[PDB]
Amino acid sequence: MNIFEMLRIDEGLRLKIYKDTEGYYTIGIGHLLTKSPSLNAAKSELDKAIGRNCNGVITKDEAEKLFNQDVDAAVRGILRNAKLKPVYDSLDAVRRCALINMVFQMGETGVAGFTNSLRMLQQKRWDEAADNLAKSRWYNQTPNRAKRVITTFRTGTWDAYK
Ligand SMILES: [Cl-]
Numbered sequence: 001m002n003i004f005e006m007l008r009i010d011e012g013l014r015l016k017i018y019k020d021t022e023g024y025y026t027i028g029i030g031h032l033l034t035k036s037p038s039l040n041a042a043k044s045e046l047d048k049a050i051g052r053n054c055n056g057v058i059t060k061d062e063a064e065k066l067f068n069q070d071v072d073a074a075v076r077g078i079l080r081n082a083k084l085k086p087v088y089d090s091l092d093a094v095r096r097c098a099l100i101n102m103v104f105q106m107g108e109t110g111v112a113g114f115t116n117s118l119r120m121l122q123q124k125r126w127d128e129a130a131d132n133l134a135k136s137r138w139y140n141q142t143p144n145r146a147k148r149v150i151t152t153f154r155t156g157t158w159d160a161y162k
């Protein structure tokens, strides 16, 4: 199991513009297009992103290209972030995947806001950090995915995904 297979399980693949769980315009593997209500604001963002006139539809290859950019952008953001970097460095390889998953989903700023949880992961107080992470809008909005991530942090294995 690797970060890519993990995010592919959590986000799915869709070759046509769609609305995310929050109601936003998305495409491919979790690639947020815009928070704007306009399908048109979305179609334009999409063509800017792909470099062609797509008319809301892309190929698998194109979805995977966007996915590779997003994962890379996610990793570089963590390593560039003064709150996230130290947590990441302190963690083992599996747990590192769990942090990248949250960042991809909620952005650097979002995750950086989970102050207490970050402090507990850094101290390797697993069960405690799992309990605190569950007290969030995130967990209440997408409980099945939150739980998977959270178990990954609690245990350090890929069990939730297997
Ligand atoms: Cl809560």
Ligand SMILES: [Cl-]
Binding pocket: 141, 142, 143, 144, 145, 146
């Ligand atoms: Cl979910």
